[PDB]
Amino acid sequence: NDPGNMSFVKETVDKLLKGYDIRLRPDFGGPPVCVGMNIDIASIDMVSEVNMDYTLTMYFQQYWRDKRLAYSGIPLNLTLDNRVADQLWVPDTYFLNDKKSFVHGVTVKNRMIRLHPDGTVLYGLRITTTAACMMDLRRYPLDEQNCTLEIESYGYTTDDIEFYWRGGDKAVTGVERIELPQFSIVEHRLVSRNVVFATGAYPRLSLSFRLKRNIGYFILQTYMPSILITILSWVSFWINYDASAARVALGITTVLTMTTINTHLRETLPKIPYVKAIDMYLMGCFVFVFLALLEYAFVNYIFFSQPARAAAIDRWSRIVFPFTFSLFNLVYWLYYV
Amino acid sequence: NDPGNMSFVKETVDKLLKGYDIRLRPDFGGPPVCVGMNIDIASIDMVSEVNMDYTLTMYFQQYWRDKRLAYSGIPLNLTLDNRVADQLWVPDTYFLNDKKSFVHGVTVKNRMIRLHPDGTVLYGLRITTTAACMMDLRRYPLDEQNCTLEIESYGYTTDDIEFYWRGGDKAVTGVERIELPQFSIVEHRLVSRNVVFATGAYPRLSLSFRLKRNIGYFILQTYMPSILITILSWVSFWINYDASAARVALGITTVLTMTTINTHLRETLPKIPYVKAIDMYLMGCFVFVFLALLEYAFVNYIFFSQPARAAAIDRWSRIVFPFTFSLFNLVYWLYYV
Amino acid sequence: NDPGNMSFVKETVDKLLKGYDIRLRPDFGGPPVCVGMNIDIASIDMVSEVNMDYTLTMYFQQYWRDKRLAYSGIPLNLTLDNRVADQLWVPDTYFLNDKKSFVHGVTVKNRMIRLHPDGTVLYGLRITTTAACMMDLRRYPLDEQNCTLEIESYGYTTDDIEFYWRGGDKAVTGVERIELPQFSIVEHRLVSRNVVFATGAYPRLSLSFRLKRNIGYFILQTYMPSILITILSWVSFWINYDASAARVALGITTVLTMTTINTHLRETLPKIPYVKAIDMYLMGCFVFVFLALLEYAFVNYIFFSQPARAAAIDRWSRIVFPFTFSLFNLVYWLYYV
Amino acid sequence: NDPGNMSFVKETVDKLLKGYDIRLRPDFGGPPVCVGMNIDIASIDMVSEVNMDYTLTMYFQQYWRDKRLAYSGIPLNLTLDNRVADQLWVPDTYFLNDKKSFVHGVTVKNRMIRLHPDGTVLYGLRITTTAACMMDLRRYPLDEQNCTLEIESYGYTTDDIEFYWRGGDKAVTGVERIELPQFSIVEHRLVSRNVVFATGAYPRLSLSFRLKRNIGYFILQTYMPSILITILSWVSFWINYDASAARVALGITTVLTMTTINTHLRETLPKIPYVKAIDMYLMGCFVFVFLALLEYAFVNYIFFSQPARAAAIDRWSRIVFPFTFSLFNLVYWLYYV
Amino acid sequence: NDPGNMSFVKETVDKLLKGYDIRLRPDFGGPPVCVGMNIDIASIDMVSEVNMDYTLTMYFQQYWRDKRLAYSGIPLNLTLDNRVADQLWVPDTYFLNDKKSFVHGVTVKNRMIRLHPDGTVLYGLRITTTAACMMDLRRYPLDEQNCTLEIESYGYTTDDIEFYWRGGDKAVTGVERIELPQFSIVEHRLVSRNVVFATGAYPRLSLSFRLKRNIGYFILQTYMPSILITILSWVSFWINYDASAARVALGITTVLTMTTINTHLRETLPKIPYVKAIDMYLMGCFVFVFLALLEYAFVNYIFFSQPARAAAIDRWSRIVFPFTFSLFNLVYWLYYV
Ligand SMILES: *[C@@H]1O[C@H](CO)[C@@H](O[C@@H]2O[C@H](CO)[C@@H](O[C@@H]3O[C@H](CO[C@H]4O[C@H](CO)[C@@H](O)[C@H](O)[C@@H]4O)[C@@H](O)[C@H](O[C@H]4O[C@H](CO)[C@@H](O)[C@H](O)[C@@H]4O)[C@@H]3O)[C@H](O)[C@H]2NC(C)=O)[C@H](O)[C@H]1NC(C)=O
Ligand SMILES: *[C@@H]1O[C@H](CO)[C@@H](O[C@@H]2O[C@H](CO)[C@@H](O[C@@H]3O[C@H](CO[C@H]4O[C@H](CO)[C@@H](O)[C@H](O)[C@@H]4O)[C@@H](O)[C@H](O[C@H]4O[C@H](CO)[C@@H](O)[C@H](O)[C@@H]4O)[C@@H]3O)[C@H](O)[C@H]2NC(C)=O)[C@H](O)[C@H]1NC(C)=O
Ligand SMILES: *[C@@H]1O[C@H](CO)[C@@H](O[C@@H]2O[C@H](CO)[C@@H](O[C@@H]3O[C@H](CO[C@H]4O[C@H](CO)[C@@H](O)[C@H](O)[C@@H]4O)[C@@H](O)[C@H](O[C@H]4O[C@H](CO)[C@@H](O)[C@H](O)[C@@H]4O)[C@@H]3O)[C@H](O)[C@H]2NC(C)=O)[C@H](O)[C@H]1NC(C)=O
Ligand SMILES: *[C@@H]1O[C@H](CO)[C@@H](O[C@@H]2O[C@H](CO)[C@@H](O[C@@H]3O[C@H](CO[C@H]4O[C@H](CO)[C@@H](O)[C@H](O)[C@@H]4O)[C@@H](O)[C@H](O[C@H]4O[C@H](CO)[C@@H](O)[C@H](O)[C@@H]4O)[C@@H]3O)[C@H](O)[C@H]2NC(C)=O)[C@H](O)[C@H]1NC(C)=O
Ligand SMILES: *[C@@H]1O[C@H](CO)[C@@H](O)[C@H](O)[C@H]1NC(C)=O
Ligand SMILES: *[C@@H]1O[C@H](CO)[C@@H](O)[C@H](O)[C@H]1NC(C)=O
Ligand SMILES: *[C@@H]1O[C@H](CO)[C@@H](O)[C@H](O)[C@H]1NC(C)=O
Ligand SMILES: *[C@@H]1O[C@H](CO)[C@@H](O)[C@H](O)[C@H]1NC(C)=O
Ligand SMILES: *[C@@H]1O[C@H](CO)[C@@H](O)[C@H](O)[C@H]1NC(C)=O
Ligand SMILES: CCCCCCCCCC
Ligand SMILES: NCCc1c[nH]cn1
Ligand SMILES: NCCc1c[nH]cn1
Ligand SMILES: NCCc1c[nH]cn1
Ligand SMILES: NCCc1c[nH]cn1
Ligand SMILES: [Cl-]
Ligand SMILES: [Cl-]
Ligand SMILES: [Cl-]
Ligand SMILES: [Cl-]
Ligand SMILES: [Cl-]
């Protein structure tokens, strides 16, 4: 009778679970059971291009109605121990594009079961999942990616289970609180549909983020060293042509440094066959430094018979190379921005 | 009487599982139980030459008949909770060449049990398996590999269980949707046979893929740097022979860069005792740059007494080296393509 | 009767657990259960900037009261086997910012259950948790970070469970015994509050540390090499200006070494998009070495027509560069200390 | 009666397992139970000098007799579901030198239980184990290693259990099909004995392989680069002694390359306190390149006053160095082969 | 009657376990139960300074007396199946300073239960534990470390459980068979005491090893390259001072090689704020090579006006530098040995 009478609550719960068959979904053989889902995104741990996946930690909450769990006489919502979730029926929800996921289990399994007088069940889990995200790196590092989390029922079709976002556009919360050092979340979308396979139509939910990559790290890491190496190559134009060792050493060092930068950058990323934007910039810088070395080679070749022509070539290169490099940078940064 | 009456369905399921012995296969002591298998490949995560394996995520579905599970009066297929699979006999199917594999268990064990009125059981799992694949890298990176997944019964012989691809050549789906950045799937084949061991004959299914390696990454990563270093070595032929430091530095840097490229490339791949195609190309490039350095050494040796001969040697080298390297590249690319 | 009579104690415990419902919290339907918590920190294993987290091993003890477990006639506290914790209600306490935590299980599960005559339960665990800690590295490596451990109830709201630090400021011990090679713990704080989510208000505890980074490692690893490279660059001001190869080699090696140091240091840290203090120092050192190389370029450019001016420029550089670098170091170390 | 009558077989199995005590070994208190063991080696995954261990995948089958499981009236071998193994007594067989081993569990636990009418039990497991193997790398990479797998009973002494290799020399199969890229399996041996510990005498089986390391990888990776660097050092002898920068650069680059090769190779292997064969070869090559540099230093020292002596020294070095290096290689390869 | 009657033994064991309460320790409410412990160290896998820990595999055996398990009429020691350990009381023994430990589980859980007529239980496990060991690397690599394993009861205090080494100083065996390539075990000690915490006094056992680091690897890896680089720097003293490029290149290469060696060695070890012995040696070698380069700088500065003084400085350096470096090595090795 009294809500505080734990004996009465125990009797009510035992009556609820007596004869309860966990093998049967609510309203088995009848209308599909509607499961409304919410996500509270705690954080996005990392976004990996090498593995083409991102790690996501969230509170995943499911909401459905089981008339077998309807109780009367207790005007309270029963928050039960998570272990009771083993004695109930729960949807076979799984993430379609994940690779490794787990439910946290310290100190207890991170699980919540709440029953309502009308038979409504709220079932919450804390899930850290590494979801696969194929990425198009043709504009890297100035690229924008779209990473999705796909939620689907495993065994039951749309004739047995239906999904919806509980709350419309506000079902997924906490996106604005995500701190990604390298990315900024431009937008997120919720999609609900049905996907047909050989075994029938299955409900599907999709939580998609659009990530815009920050460029400051790559400016500090790759572009500035390339510009500095190109200017270092230009330095040889003010050295006298008789100093063969000095200018040849400058050319060799700049060329080898550009090649090492390019190879190291490519080794950092996964083995993709196409050419990226940063690869184009590095190849342009390599062309510039190699042309500077070839210019000195020409000057050394012709400076014995025609010293005036060699001096003129050096003097003209001193102006041509910075101007042409400025034009190359201008067109490059206009194309990719 | 009523398919929508959950009490009747519970009674029927309990009657099916009453007296059910999970230790005995269907038709125990009689004809072998036929199990048909389908695979829906979600993705191929990675292909590693270093570990000689590949990761594969799939929906693995088995189909058999258990007359003990035949039910009447319910004109519906019973999609039961996955936990009921712990109370039923399931085939001891395993992957012969796998190293690590698991079944995804978020938010529940990715498992599906469907019963049919005639006693047919459909049993689905979502499995991520890392299968070993020995690779013949003698034509690397222009090689073509053949990686197989072998499926076999562990304890039961052909007198007890038989395997067949359910649907013939259409048993495996999703192969055309696989996105491997480094490989392209030329073909896939399904094979069914029996393998004899000391304990008897066992059914065996095989799903084999033929992968062709995309060459763009290795063109951008290894071949182009080698060509550029060889051209850089050629640059020394236009430098005056009195500039000993410059030309010796050019030769040294080219030789050392070629050696470092070769060693790094060999370190990237697993330790194999034979020579790869890319190794042949790198050794040829090293020979060319070393011959350039030796040519300068000869010119420096003879340029005091015979300056005209030294100048003639430099002039002839300026033509001979590019032409010979072009011929070497031509024959190399004709041999391996 | 006799406390040493094991049969009497067994009967008492069986009476305690007879009719006990683990699905219901103590005082279910009435006042919330107050759960006090103590932490004895065994060690902070590591602090990772790349992963933005820290590993922490602790003895986490919870203290609550369940009148269902009150016993009389035994004037002793019952230290029971840890397995009995599976037959009792325990709080659904979890860590908000953890990423991978576990309870040690050798030789048995590192778990303690102690019962008191009035029904008080003490429940201890040994937990190794990897808690996330976002770090602001703008003053790196002279930064001061703040890492928190958040403790919260998962299912029950403040209407059911309340948290408090058992012992106040002395509720957490072992902080003074923490030996971090790279950090020193300036202070730790304990905070108790309530956090409101869509499902209601939940209790919250926070154990926060203020970590100060030791600077000796970075002095020995980054700053001293940069200073030595800058002094090496200054060395070229004493070499004769006609030794073009020597001075150009000095400039090239110093500039390239500075760039490689900067790039390696950036690659040792997470891909943050901003500029750190050590990045500013490295950029200053790079500017100094580049200015030295450009100074030699100017001297070589003008040394044929105006040798006296070139000698004067070298002589003035010998004084200006050390003085300017000393001023730069002075202002840098005054700004960041 | 009918072997195909599943009810009769279920009754027989229930009678077999009724009153069965898994805590008691067969013939408890009497003669020891003989367990015969077979191994079908599927593969040897990898051999690690750094970790001093090797990974092995195998089908491990045990054969014993349990009179409690003897059944009559069924002239068939009962292949039972693997789960029945949880209800039977199985030997406590473990691997003495293993470090991390597991039983494959997809799709089910890779376990086989087969019973015979006379109570004979065949129990098979597919096991992957990382077994430690201490290696003597004094003759590395021309070394020959001996790696063993040790099988022992953990709790039962020779008064309770006895091991034997079932089939004798043919107990272990699949050795000839093992494909190790770096090693070749010269021989394998099977040993059976008893080992005395503080608790008594325990049965012991040993499966040992003798592996011979292939040399092709190290020929292409370490020896050839060293030889090429030594020839590069010799190149300086034909350069004129007035080209001080060129010859000094050749000496410096060869010496530094040799040192880096040696240090990298030592870093790849575990921190062993002794000298390997390849270490001896690398030290010899370093001695040769250092002697070449010192020879140029002597020539540059004495070439001003005595040009004829310097030219004679260079001419003699051109012959002495290649010949002495050939002799060194000859004696080195004779000693280690 | 007869011990060979398995039915009688099963009856005896069932009577022993009938009414057995695993929640109560032996002599609950009375005198503390004394637990005697033995360790048979199988191996010490690896000692890591970076992680500051060591991996240890051991047979850990506990010995106690439970009068509830005393049986009569069977003059034998009952070696029971390890699974019966789940039906008995076992001490809550744990390792105070472990980080990740597991009990091996192939083929079965590596566990042993042996009962004696007087109710004495022997309980053995095979445990691989990674125990933290704080190390003082000030005298590294000539350091001597002290790594301990701490064994303690988790829940029971000294009023309930007491620990002692069974066999005194011979309780721990197998120490002399430990093969650490990088360390030699000078001594091992056993300590027994009691530690007071807020919850009471707990028994404590300690097994400590004193490890002395072998110096051969570091002699071959760090000291010899440093000495060789210093001699290489000395080489420049015999080169003519007019060869500016050669001597400046020698100085630059030696200085940069020393810096790279020091930085790489510091990177190998964990980040520590103090200076190690090898750091002192490397800094001394850097000072020597830098002083050689500065000596050449002075010679080049003064060799135009005072050629005789420059020649005298070179000649005196040729003797001073080797002698001073020999003195530095002598004092360094005397200090640290
Ligand atoms: C990352 O990339 C993914 C994949 O490309 C993007 O996901 C797509 O998102 C769009 C919305 O932005 C989806 O389009 C919408 O689909 C809804 C569901 O369609 C299902 O049901 C209808 C019948 O009702 C079927 O015809 C259909 O085949 C599906 O089964 C529609 O209801 C939406 O309709 C809206 O637009 C139409 C006009 O086009 C209007 O008439 C409607 O009123 C309504 O406004 C819409 O079509 C698309 O389906 C998603 N694709 C997938 C594969 O899921 C992510 O958006 C992207 N991430 C970001 C951040 O952009
Ligand atoms: C990667 O590499 C693997 C291994 O080499 C390849 O696998 C082989 O694939 C071929 C098919 O492409 C297989 O050949 C087929 O084998 C079937 C099974 O043979 C067993 O059973 C028959 C009796 O039914 C026995 O006679 C036989 O000895 C075996 O015990 C056959 O049924 C097939 O028959 C077909 O061809 C024959 C002619 O050869 C015709 O007469 C038939 O009518 C029919 O058309 C066929 O022979 C081969 O067995 C596979 N090998 C293994 C070890 O499994 C993969 O194909 C490769 N990857 C790719 C992509 O190609
Ligand atoms: C890798 O390294 C390991 C360790 O060194 C090698 O293992 C040894 O292998 C040899 C065989 O090659 C073993 O020697 C044999 O041991 C048998 C068992 O001895 C026990 O039992 C007998 C009674 O049966 C006792 O007397 C004895 O004390 C032991 O308790 C013997 O039965 C064998 O005897 C055979 O040879 C002798 C002559 O030597 C004859 O007189 C006999 O008639 C008979 O033919 C033999 O002595 C040795 O025990 C193994 N040691 C260990 C520690 O396991 C591996 O062989 C090696 N790997 C490879 C590939 O070689
Ligand atoms: C690595 O480093 C650790 C930590 O420093 C070393 O461990 C210490 O080892 C020494 C022995 O070598 C230990 O000293 C011994 O402690 C015992 C326990 O003391 C407790 O109990 C006594 C009462 O029984 C109390 O008085 C005391 O306060 C403690 O509560 C003592 O029983 C031992 O007594 C012995 O020496 C005394 C004289 O000092 C004699 O009178 C006794 O008869 C007896 O011979 C002794 O004092 C010390 O406690 C250990 N410290 C820790 C923290 O465990 C390791 O030894 C070291 N590794 C190596 C290889 O050396
Ligand atoms: C509490 O509920 C139980 C079970 O219905 C009942 O027996 C008991 O009387 C109730 N308590 C009171 C005070 O009525
Ligand atoms: C459902 O089936 C049960 C068992 O046969 C029966 O008792 C019950 O009356 C049925 N439901 C209805 C509405 O008749
Ligand atoms: C111990 O308690 C049991 C249960 O109350 C009782 O039957 C037994 O007699 C007691 N022991 C003694 C010695 O009285
Ligand atoms: C099968 O065995 C059971 C149990 O002995 C028996 O009741 C049944 O009649 C048998 N089947 C046939 C067809 O005889
Ligand atoms: C073995 O012990 C059981 C149980 O006491 C008994 O029933 C049986 O007769 C004994 N066997 C013999 C041969 O005495
Ligand atoms: C950067 C330090 C350079 C030291 C040169 C010393 C020359 C002294 C000439 C009197
Ligand atoms: N199902 C194959 C089992 C096997 C192979 N080899 C030995 N046992
Ligand atoms: N105990 C907090 C549960 C939660 C957070 N967000 C959503 N649900
Ligand atoms: N069965 C091996 C038991 C053992 C070895 N060492 C100590 N105990
Ligand atoms: N067995 C010691 C338990 C402990 C330590 N600190 C707090 N509790
Ligand atoms: Cl966790
Ligand atoms: Cl998973
Ligand atoms: Cl652990
Ligand atoms: Cl597995
Ligand atoms: Cl294990």
CSV table of C-alpha atoms in Angstrom, one decimal, chain C residues 1-13 16 70-80 115-118, chain E residues 24 28-29:
chain,number,residue,atom,x,y,z
C,1,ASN,CA,24.8,-17.1,21.0
C,2,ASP,CA,28.6,-17.6,20.8
C,3,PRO,CA,30.2,-15.2,18.3
C,4,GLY,CA,32.8,-17.9,17.6
C,5,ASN,CA,30.1,-20.4,16.7
C,6,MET,CA,30.2,-20.5,12.9
C,7,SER,CA,26.8,-22.1,12.7
C,8,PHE,CA,25.2,-19.2,14.5
C,9,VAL,CA,26.9,-16.7,12.3
C,10,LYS,CA,25.9,-18.6,9.2
C,11,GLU,CA,22.3,-18.7,10.4
C,12,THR,CA,22.4,-15.0,11.1
C,13,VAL,CA,23.8,-14.2,7.6
C,16,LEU,CA,19.9,-11.4,6.7
C,70,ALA,CA,21.2,-5.1,10.5
C,71,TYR,CA,22.0,-8.0,12.9
C,72,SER,CA,22.0,-8.4,16.7
C,73,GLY,CA,23.7,-10.7,19.1
C,74,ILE,CA,27.1,-10.5,17.5
C,75,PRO,CA,29.2,-7.7,19.0
C,76,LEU,CA,31.6,-7.7,16.0
C,77,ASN,CA,31.9,-6.4,12.5
C,78,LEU,CA,31.5,-9.1,9.8
C,79,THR,CA,34.2,-9.0,7.2
C,80,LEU,CA,32.6,-11.2,4.5
C,115,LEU,CA,28.9,-5.3,7.6
C,116,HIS,CA,28.3,-3.5,10.9
C,117,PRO,CA,25.7,-4.4,13.6
C,118,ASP,CA,23.5,-1.4,12.8
E,24,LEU,CA,32.9,-17.2,6.5
E,28,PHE,CA,35.4,-17.1,11.9
E,29,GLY,CA,35.0,-15.0,15.1
